[PDB]
Design a protein around this ligand. Structure first.
Ligand SMILES: *[C@@H]1O[C@H](CO)[C@@H](O[C@@H]2O[C@H](CO)[C@@H](O)[C@H](O)[C@H]2NC(C)=O)[C@H](O)[C@H]1NC(C)=O
Ligand SMILES: *[C@@H]1O[C@H](CO)[C@@H](O[C@@H]2O[C@H](CO)[C@@H](O)[C@H](O)[C@H]2NC(C)=O)[C@H](O)[C@H]1NC(C)=O
Ligand SMILES: *[C@@H]1O[C@H](CO)[C@@H](O)[C@H](O)[C@H]1NC(C)=O
Ligand SMILES: *[C@@H]1O[C@H](CO)[C@@H](O)[C@H](O)[C@H]1NC(C)=O
Ligand SMILES: *[C@@H]1O[C@H](CO)[C@@H](O)[C@H](O)[C@H]1NC(C)=O
Ligand SMILES: *[C@@H]1O[C@H](CO)[C@@H](O)[C@H](O)[C@H]1NC(C)=O
Ligand SMILES: *[C@@H]1O[C@H](CO)[C@@H](O)[C@H](O)[C@H]1NC(C)=O
Ligand SMILES: *[C@@H]1O[C@H](CO)[C@@H](O)[C@H](O)[C@H]1NC(C)=O
Ligand SMILES: *[C@@H]1O[C@H](CO)[C@@H](O)[C@H](O)[C@H]1NC(C)=O
Ligand SMILES: *[C@@H]1O[C@H](CO)[C@@H](O)[C@H](O)[C@H]1NC(C)=O
Lengths: 46, 219, 164, 148, 46
């Protein structure tokens, strides 16, 4: 009422991984943008 | 004289609202605990990357700035003025007095002597901070007006600066000045560098605190 | 010019105007005319506010931006609010419902009947029974409790009794 | 669907994820700022005092909302010629400045006005460049500007 | 398939897999998934 770190750590690890997964949807990896509606708007299909 | 900012010159770096979070940015800021010039009452200064600019009074001695590369003809410059009426932004090629000012009868404006080729017009104690920057042909201006309970010394505290005017003034910039209302009847200048900060956002979406991440090991 | 109303064709005053455009430096353009289009509400749409482009359902909100703030975003940096540039009202953005579909089979060697679960979807957006695992169609909700046979989730199971 | 995703004509009891599901957008909407600056264009449109040909005017045009789409569909003039892009491609752009010069000439000489021309209004009194963007509009005003 | 015709001497680069042009956008198109040869030879002597 005034220690559950082993239970807190497995929650934290899973959340830290799920956030890293979503934060990768905003990297270019060597492209002009991160949005498909921006490559499909200033580039021809080829 | 020189003085020490404490935590001053923080502006909202985008239009994005944020609720209770801690957001990290890379931008041009005025580093914490910096070496800011002191001026009393003035000369041609550099620009080189943005400018912080505070000022203190109850009367209005500070009556705008003038910008540019040569502050004359043969190249274009900006001019931001305020008589007792209201602000007058203007962009022509000018001929500026090497010591330009305005009087206080109450007749004034010995500022320039030329207004050629104008490419943009516009017409219409206290602590008044301003951040001026110039990127991709846009000249951005952030500002804030806080009330001091002193008259003319730089205080301590935190207060984020909100974006104001903005246009395609462009006009390459390398130098700037100030304008003062004479006697006939205190201001500082910081510079901005690329830093990384950690801004704390309130639940209404205002920046209440910050961390400069290159001050010391704790930061 | 010697003008008179009885002059021949071509000898008439013709008022002239020419246009001459500027496209050197600076990108601060005022543009011409846009073209709004009112605004629905509570439907999956393709929206576009000033260049903010996405799809979802727009509702009215209880946020309060700052006069210069134009849209909001949350942790993980997804846009979850917006300001529309004519009413000056802020709107919540919610993704348009999606999920998985599972079929509950009592075994093809026993029957050809199936039930279908739409995972974490409210039943309105698809006899019909609402669980916490989603919306379940094609299974009757009895009141007795047996051992678990096929796990549905959140405490619910399904089974082929008697025939249904 | 189960038999397809399991690749088998027999299936055993269980629960099987077979596909996904999602709601489709009903329509599309667009929002944009009003105008705040209807911009000026009447001073030169409706009746007004014009100038001579060497006293041709000039105008620095500041921000504002265009409306050419109306002058394009107007077509109540003898002349609507843009050497440059079509005005269909014009009402959707963002420039820095447009310039407006105004004067009155006779009707039997308006074809002296093209970027690269000749004659005393091309040689003297006015001058175009050879490469051109803008548009030229002219209309007779004999009803009002000629008199007995 | 032998497609045989005559063009202006400029838009010979308009017969190619994947492109934009007044000849390619209105009078003749090849898919981006093209597989075959293109032969061109001059003709004002015929
Ligand atoms: C855009 O224009 C419309 C009118 O064309 C404005 O609508 C008015 O908005 C005020 C609220 O400030 C209402 O009290 C009026 O009843 C509205 N009138 C009409 C006719 O709709 C709107 O405010 C304008 N917005 C901007 C940003 O310019
Ligand atoms: C220029 O101004 C005149 C006068 O204000 C406008 O003429 C009006 O046109 C409408 C529709 O044709 C008529 O119903 C009115 O009777 C006209 N006015 C008068 C006083 O009779 C004209 O529309 C204006 N031009 C433009 C392009 O707006
Ligand atoms: C600011 O820099 C000048 C440069 O000589 C130095 O003399 C002065 O002590 C510095 N001020 C502070 C507060 O460090
Ligand atoms: C204030 O200064 C501007 C600068 O041009 C001027 O246009 C304006 O007329 C001045 N105010 C008054 C009242 O004259
Ligand atoms: C700028 O002014 C000078 C002198 O008044 C003039 O020679 C020059 O043509 C002007 N610039 C333009 C683009 O007309
Ligand atoms: C500003 O000055 C630099 C000098 O290095 C010059 O190269 C540049 O073109 C100028 N800016 C513009 C917009 O011309
Ligand atoms: C602003 O924030 C304060 C404290 O964080 C809160 O009490 C208030 O409700 C918020 N909204 C206002 C003042 O409109
Ligand atoms: C499956 O069907 C076969 C053929 O009818 C039968 O022999 C077998 O018992 C069935 N399996 C069961 C009922 O578990
Ligand atoms: C499903 O939609 C209904 C209809 O508005 C609503 O009342 C209910 O709260 C929603 N959720 C559940 C679990 O029924
Ligand atoms: C199940 O039992 C509850 C008792 O609270 C009753 O209200 C409900 O109608 C019953 N449902 C069926 C299908 O018998």
């Amino acid at each position: 009422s005034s220690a559950l770190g082993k239970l807190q750590d497995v929650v934290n690890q899973n959340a830290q991984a799920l956030n890293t997964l979503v934060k990768q949807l905003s990297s270019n990896f060597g492209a002009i943008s991160s949005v498909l509606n921006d490559i499909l708007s200033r580039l021809d299909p080829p | 004289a020189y003085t020490n900012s404490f935590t001053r010159g923080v502006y909202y770096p985008d239009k994005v609202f944020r609720s209770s979070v801690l957001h990290s940015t890379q931008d041009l800021f005025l580093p914490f605990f910096s070496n800011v010039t002191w001026f009393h009452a003035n000369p041609v200064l550099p620009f080189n990357d943005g400018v912080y600019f505070a000022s203190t009074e109850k009367s209005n001695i500070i009556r705008g700035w003038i910008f540019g590369t040569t502050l004359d003809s043969k190249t274009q410059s900006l001019l931001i003025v305020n008589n007792a009426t209201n602000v007058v932004i203007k962009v022509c090629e000018f001929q500026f007095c090497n010591d330009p000012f305005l009087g206080v009868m109450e007749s004034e404006f010995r500022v320039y002597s030329s207004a050629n080729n104008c490419t943009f017009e516009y017409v219409s104690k206290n602590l008044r901070e301003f951040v001026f920057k110039n990127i991709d042909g846009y000249f951005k201006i952030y500002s804030k007006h806080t009330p001091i309970n002193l008259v003319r010394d730089l205080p301590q505290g935190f207060s984020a600066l909100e974006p104001l005017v903005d246009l395609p003034i462009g006009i390459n910039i390398t130098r700037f000045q100030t304008l003062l209302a004479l006697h006939r009847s205190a201001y500082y200048v910081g510079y901005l560098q690329p830093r990384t900060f950690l801004l704390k956002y309130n639940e209404n979406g205002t920046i209440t605190d910050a961390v400069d991440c290159a001050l010391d090991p704790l930061s | 010019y010697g003008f008179q109303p009885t002059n021949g064709v071509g000898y008439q005053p013709y008022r002239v105007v020419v246009l001459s455009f500027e496209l050197l430096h600076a990108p601060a353009t005022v543009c011409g005319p846009k073209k709004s289009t009112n605004l629905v509400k509570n439907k999956c749409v393709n929206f576009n506010f000033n260049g903010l482009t996405g799809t979802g359902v727009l509702t009215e909100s209880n946020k309060k931006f700052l006069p210069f703030q134009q849209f909001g975003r949350d942790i993980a940096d997804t846009t979850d609010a917006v300001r529309d540039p004519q009413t000056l009202e802020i709107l919540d953005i919610t993704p348009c419902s999606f999920g998985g579909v599972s079929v509950i089979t009592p075994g093809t060697n026993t029957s050809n009947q199936v039930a279908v679960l739409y995972q974490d979807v409210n039943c309105t957006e698809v006899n019909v029974f609402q669980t916490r695992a989603g919306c379940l169609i094609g299974a009757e909700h009895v009141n007795n409790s047996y051992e678990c046979d096929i796990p549905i989730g959140a405490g619910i199971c399904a089974s082929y009794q008697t025939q249904s | 669907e189960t038999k397809c995703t399991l690749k088998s004509f027999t299936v055993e009891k269980g629960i099987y994820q077979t596909s996904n599901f999602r709601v489709q957008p009903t329509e599309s909407i667009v929002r944009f700022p009003n105008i705040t600056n209807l911009c000026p264009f009447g001073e030169v449109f409706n009746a007004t005092r014009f100038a001579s040909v060497y006293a041709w005017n000039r105008k620095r045009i500041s921000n504002c909302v265009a409306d050419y789409s109306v002058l394009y569909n107007s077509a109540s003039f003898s002349t609507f010629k843009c050497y440059g892009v079509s005005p269909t491609k014009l009402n959707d752009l963002c420039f820095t400045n447009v310039y407006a010069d105004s004067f009155v000439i006779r009707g039997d000489e308006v074809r002296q006005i093209a970027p690269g021309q000749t004659g005393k209004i091309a040689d003297y009194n006015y001058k175009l460049p050879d490469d051109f963007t803008g548009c030229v509009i002219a209309w007779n005003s004999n009803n009002l500007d000629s008199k007995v």
